[PDB]
Symmetry: C3
Subunit: 451 residues, 3 copies
C-alpha cells in the first residue's frame, strides 16, 4: 500500500506512484573552520631520521597550504532556465572576505567548535572548528622541536600529527581537484558525526531534523562547498546543504514508450511517444516537473531531487495520465516516422516497444524465454520476469515490491491516419498536431474544392 | 591488414573499419564479503600514546561502519530507451536481505575466501572474503588490549591494523561518496589479483577467460557495485561485471561532416550531414548501432562498448556507406541552412568542412601550413599531418598505424536545388526529404497549372 | 570599471562584458618519469613484524606495477565538430615506444630531474624525474635486506619507503581508475611546485609565464595525462598542458530568455528566445563562440575556456546584441508555442520569464518579497536581491561587483502575429522565420486572390 505501478496502453506509458518527495526548496550555508598555523621555518642542525620525517610532514602541510593560497579563488527539458548553484556559498565567503569578520568568528569559536554567528550581511550562519592545527603545531612541536635539541625519539609524534593532518591535506587536495568547488563533499570536509550535529543544530523542523539527520547518503550529492578564506590563522570554507520546505508529499515517476501502427511494411510507419518522461512531485497545489532523470535520485521510497531542474505545472497535467486528448491541459508528445525497436524501464517492469521485426522476449533467470511479443507496444512486469531482450540488449527489471496494473485501451495512433501526417515533431503536443492536421486537410480540400 | 580507413566524399563521411568488438551482452554478479566485528567498547584507564593511536584507529573504523549502517539502500540518439543498470546487483543484494542467506554464505566462506554459492533466488553467484576484520580485531588486539594491562608497546600493532583497515575504510568512504553506487569500482572493493582470480574462476569460455582476465583497464568503466548488507558480522557488497557473449567480430566507427554548396554568398547556403556518427558492431547477423560516442571506449585495435545504448539495425544499413540513395534502407541525415566552418576527427584522419571563409589549413609540428583548402569538404590523413586549424581551433590527429582511402564522388548536395528545400531537418532521411520535395514540387506546379 | 552587465529587453537577453579571455589555442606535452625498480624477489627465512611490513610494502608496490603493466596503453551547439583530445599525449607516448628513445631520456635526466630533450619525432619536449624508486629500493633496502640477516629493526625505514611510494601507488591507481586517461591530473602525477617550475621552464612568454604559473586551480581541468611506457626501469607518462596564444582580450557571456505575447489565455501563446547563450571571446579579429557553457570556466574576472567547443563567428555577430533585425548577420533564435515560467542567471542578476500565471518574486534574505512581476519578460539585478522564486524554484543571484544597465525596448514578439506563425523552430533565425512567414502569406493570399 506504499508503492505500485500502473501502465496505460492508451498512450503507452508507465507511472510509478510510490516514492515520497524530498525537494530542496531552500538552501543553508555553514562556514566550517580549521585553526591553521603560520609555522616559523623549522631548523635542526643535525639530521635524525625521525626529525626528517617530522620535517617532511611539516613540508607536506606547507605545500598543502601553498596550493590552497594559490587556489583562494584569486525531447522536452531544454527550457528550464539554469541557476547559479554556488551563489550562496561564495556570497557568504565574500562576506567573510571583509577584513573584520574573521576575528569575530575566531573569537566566537575560541571555546567550542560549533556556534551560530551573524555575519556582516545579516543572514545568520552556523560555523564549526573541526580540526585544530594551532594546538598540535604550537604546543606539541615547538617546545619539542628546539633549534639544536631536536630530541624527537618519540616516533608516535609523527603518527599523531599525520592523523590530525591528513584531513586538511585531503581538504586542500579536493580544493585543487575540483576547482575549489566539489560535489559531493568528502568526509574530510565534514565528518559524518559532525554532519549529524550540524543537522540537529540548524533551524529546521523536528520531523525535518530527523529526516535530514538520517539521510546523509544523498545530501552530499545535493551539497556543495567552495573555499572562503585563509585570512588569519584559519582555513574557512563554506558548505551548502538543503532545506526541505516540501516533505511528506506522495510523488511519482513517468516513463514513456512509442505508439505506432503495425503495418507489415518496415518503412512508411507512423510513431508517437509521450515526451514528458521524468518526475512529478507535489509541493504547493501544482506539480513539479523534472524533465531529465539526471536531476533526481532514489532511496527505497524517498526520492531526493533538486528543484532547479523543475518547472511548476498545473495539477490538471495529472489528467494527461488518463486522457491525453482532454483540452484542459495540452499534453506534450513527439512524433516520428522511423520504425525501430526498443524498451524502457518502469519501477516494477519494462515496456517493450517491439517495432520492426526484432525478436523481443521476456524471461526469468532460471526459466528462459517465457513470453514472446508481436510487433507493438506491450508491457511486462517484474513479478516473474527479470530479463527482457530486444534486438541484442538484455535489460534487467528492478525487483522492488509492488502491485502492477495494466489499463487496456486503443492507442491514439489508430486515430491518426497516414498520407497527411507531418513526419517531424519533437516539441509537439495534441493541440499542435491537431491544428497542423486540420491545416493540411483544409489545404487539400480547398485545392480540390476549387475545381 | 588489421585497421585502416576510408572516407567517402559522396556524403562527406569517414569510416574506421579496424576495431574488434567487445560487447557486454551479458551481466554477472559477485557478492564480495569482508568479515566485520561488533567490537566491544574499548577501555583503558591510563593513557599511553600508542594506546591512544589504537583507540583512534578503532574509532575511525567505528565511524566507517556507522556510515555503512546509515547508508542502507533498499541528431539521432534520443529514441534508444534507457535501462536499469543497478537492477541485477541490488536484486542480488535484496536476495541477501533475506535473513537466512548470510549465515549460509558465511559458512560456505569459513575455510577459503572464494566459492560458488547458490542464493535463495536460484541464480548461482560467486563470493569472496578478501579482507578479514574479525581475526585481527579478536585474537590479535583483544587478548593484548586488556582493560587495565594495555601493554601495547609494540608499535607495529597499529601499523598492521591500519594496513588491514584502510581497505574497508575506503570501501565505506566510496559507499558515502557515490550514493553507495559507484563506477568505476576502486581496488579496495576488489584487489587486482582477486579480480584476475574472479575472472578465471567464473563460468565463461577459456578464450573469454583469457580475454577479460587480461582486459582489466576498461572493465571497471563497465563494472558496477552497490552495497548489499552488513547483516551479521560481515560487510557484503555486490559487483556487476560484463559477460562478452559476442566477441571476435570486426566492428567499425562512423564520423560525419556536412555537405554544402559553395556559393560565394555566405548566406542562403544549403547544408546536409550524415546524422549517423557513432559505432557499428556486428553480433547476430545485424549490426549494433551506438549513436553517441560516450557509450563506447577504445584501447588499441579492440573497442569495448556497452550495449544499453545500442539498437539492432539491418545489415543493409552498411550499404548506407556506399550509396546513401539506395532504397533498401532509408539512410538518416540532417539538413540545415547555417554556413559555418568546422572539422571532425576519425581514427586515421581529419575531415575539414571548411565553410564560410575561415582560413583552414593542414600542417605538421615541424612544417606548419603545408596544405590550404577551399570552401568545402576536404579530407586529410594522419600520415604527414598532425595539426589542422579551422578558424582558431587547432586540432591534433591520432597517429595510429593505418592505410587511408579517399573515394571521390559528386556530393549529393549538388542534386538538391535551392528555392524549394526546407531549411529545418534533423531527424530527416533520404526518403523523408524526397517526399517533402515531391510535396513542394506538386504544390508549386499545381498552383501554376490551374491558371 | 572592470565588469558590468547590460540586459536588452528587445530580445530578452543579458550580456556580462567584464571577463578576460584565457584560450588554450596551443597544446604542450611533457613526459614525466619516475625511476622504477626491477626488484629481485625478497627473501627472509624467519618472520619479524618489521620484516613482514617491509615485505607487504614491497608487494603493494609489485601489485601497483602489475596494474601498470596490464594497463600498458596498447538549441545550437550540435555542429561544432569534435576533436581528438588525447592525440598529442598518446602520440608522444608512441614516439617513446620506439626502442631507443627511453635510454636517451633516462641519460638526459641522470644528473638532474628536469631537462628539455628532442624526441625521435623532432618536436622537443620537457621531462622530469620527480620520484626515484631505484635509489631507495637499491641502496637502502638490498644492503639491509640480506637473505638471512634481515635486521631491519629501524621502524622508520617503512615510513620513509611508504612516503616515497604512495605517490607512485596513487599514480598507478589513477591509471587504473580513469582508463589510464584522467582529467584533472592529481598532484601525485605532478607536484604543485614541480608544476610551477615546469611553467617557468617551458617555452612561453614572460607575461604568459607568470599568467600560467599563478593559475594552477583551473589548468588541471584543462590538463590531460595518459600512460606512455614502463620500458626500462622507469615509469613514463605524458602530461598535456595549455598554451595561451590568445590572452589580454576582453570577453563576455551571453544569457538568454524567451519573449512572448501576454494574452490572458494560457494556450495559443507565441514565444521566442535567443538560442545563442554561451561564451564570446575575441582572439583574431573575429569572435569565438562556445555554445554550451560546459566548455568554459570562471575565476574572478577571468574566464578560462577550451576552444575545441568553439567556432569563429564574424565580429558582426556582436551587432546581434543591439539589433537582432540587422541583415548583416542572421541572428539565431528559437520559436515555440509552449507557455511556461522560468528564469535564467547572468553574471550580476537574473532574467525572469514569468509566463503563464506563476507567482514570480524577487526578494532579499532579510527583506522577503520586495518585487512582484506581471506576466512577461522582466529582469532583476543582484544589488538588493538574492532570492528570485518562480513557481516553486528559489534561485540565488551571484553577488559580484558590477553596474547593471537595463535597455528598454518593445519585444520583437510584438511584430510577429499569430494565426500564421509556425509553432516549431529551434535552429531557426530571423531570416529563416521571415522567409517562412512570407511564404505563408503568399500562399494564403494567392489562394484567396485566385477567386
Ligand atoms: C470544418 C471544421 O470542422 N473546422 C474545424 C475548425 O472550425 C476548428 O477550429 C478546428 C479545431 O477544432 O477543427 C476543424
Ligand atoms: C508578397 C511579399 O511579401 N513579398 C516579399 C518579397 O517581395 C521580398 O523579396 C521578400 C524578401 O524576403 O519578402 C516577401
Ligand atoms: C517524386 O516524384 C514523383 C512526383 O511526380 C512522385 O510520384 C514520386 O513518387 C517521387 N519520387 C520519385 C519520383 O523518386
Amino acid at each position: 500500500q506504499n508503492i505500485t505501478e500502473e501502465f496505460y496502453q492508451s498512450t503507452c506509458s508507465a507511472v510509478s506512484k510510490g516514492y515520497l518527495s524530498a525537494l530542496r526548496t531552500g538552501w543553508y550555508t555553514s562556514v566550517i573552520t580549521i585553526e591553521l598555523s603560520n609555522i616559523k621555518e623549522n631548523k635542526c642542525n643535525g639530521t635524525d631520521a625521525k626529525v626528517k620525517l617530522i620535517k617532511q610532514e611539516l613540508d607536506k602541510y606547507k605545500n598543502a597550504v601553498t596550493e590552497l593560497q594559490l587556489l583562494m579563488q584569486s525531447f522536452l527539458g531544454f527550457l528550464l532556465g539554469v541557476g547559479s548553484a554556488i551563489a550562496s556559498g561564495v556570497a557568504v565567503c565574500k562576506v567573510l572576505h571583509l577584513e573584520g569578520e574573521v576575528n569575530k568568528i575566531k573569537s566566537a569559536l575560541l571555546s567550542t567548535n560549533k556556534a551560530v554567528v551573524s555575519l556582516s550581511n545579516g543572514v545568520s550562519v552556523l560555523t564549526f572548528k573541526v580540526l585544530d592545527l594551532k594546538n598540535y603545531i604550537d604546543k606539541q612541536l615547538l617546545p619539542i622541536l628546539n633549534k639544536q635539541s631536536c630530541s624527537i625519539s618519540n616516533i608516535e609524534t609523527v603518527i599523531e600529527f599525520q592523523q590530525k593532518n591528513n584531513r586538511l591535506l585531503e581538504i586542500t587536495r579536493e580544493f585543487s581537484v575540483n576547482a575549489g568547488v566539489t560535489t559531493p563533499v568528502s568526509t574530510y570536509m565534514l565528518t559524518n558525526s559532525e554532519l549529524l550535529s550540524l543537522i540537529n543544530d540548524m533551524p529546521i523542523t523536528n520531523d525535518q531534523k530527523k529526516l535530514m539527520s538520517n539521510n546523509v547518503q544523498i545530501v552530499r550529492q545535493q551539497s556543495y562547498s567552495i573555499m572562503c578564506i585563509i585570512k588569519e590563522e584559519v582555513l574557512a570554507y563554506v558548505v551548502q546543504l538543503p532545506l526541505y520546505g516540501v516533505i511528506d508529499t506522495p510523488c511519482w515517476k513517468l516513463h514513456t514508450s512509442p505508439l505506432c501502427t503495425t503495418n507489415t511494411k518496415e518503412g512508411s510507419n507512423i510513431c508517437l511517444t509521450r515526451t514528458d518522461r521524468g518526475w512529478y512531485c507535489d509541493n504547493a497545489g501544482s506539480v513539479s516537473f523534472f524533465p531529465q532523470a539526471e536531476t533526481c535520485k532514489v532511496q527505497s521510497n524517498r526520492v531526493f531531487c533538486d528543484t532547479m531542474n523543475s518547472l511548476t505545472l498545473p495539477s490538471e497535467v495529472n489528467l494527461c495520465n488518463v486522457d491525453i486528448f482532454n483540452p484542459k491541459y495540452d499534453c506534450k508528445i513527439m512524433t516520428s516516422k522511423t520504425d525501430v525497436s526498443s524498451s524502457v524501464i518502469t519501477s516494477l517492469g519494462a515496456i517493450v516497444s517491439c517495432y520492426g521485426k526484432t525478436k523481443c522476449t521476456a524471461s526469468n533467470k532460471n526459466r528462459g524465454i517465457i513470453k514472446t511479443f508481436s510487433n507493438g507496444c506491450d508491457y511486462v512486469s517484474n513479478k516473474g520476469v527479470d530479463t527482457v531482450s530486444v534486438g541484442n540488449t538484455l535489460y534487467y527489471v528492478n525487483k522492488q515490491e509492488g502491485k502492477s496494473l495494466y489499463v487496456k485501451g486503443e492507442p491514439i495512433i489508430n486515430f491518426y491516419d497516414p498520407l497527411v501526417f507531418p513526419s517531424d515533431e519533437f516539441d509537439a503536443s495534441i493541440s499542435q498536431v491537431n491544428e497542423k492536421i486540420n491545416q493540411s486537410l483544409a489545404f487539400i480540400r480547398k485545392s480540390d474544392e476549387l475545381l
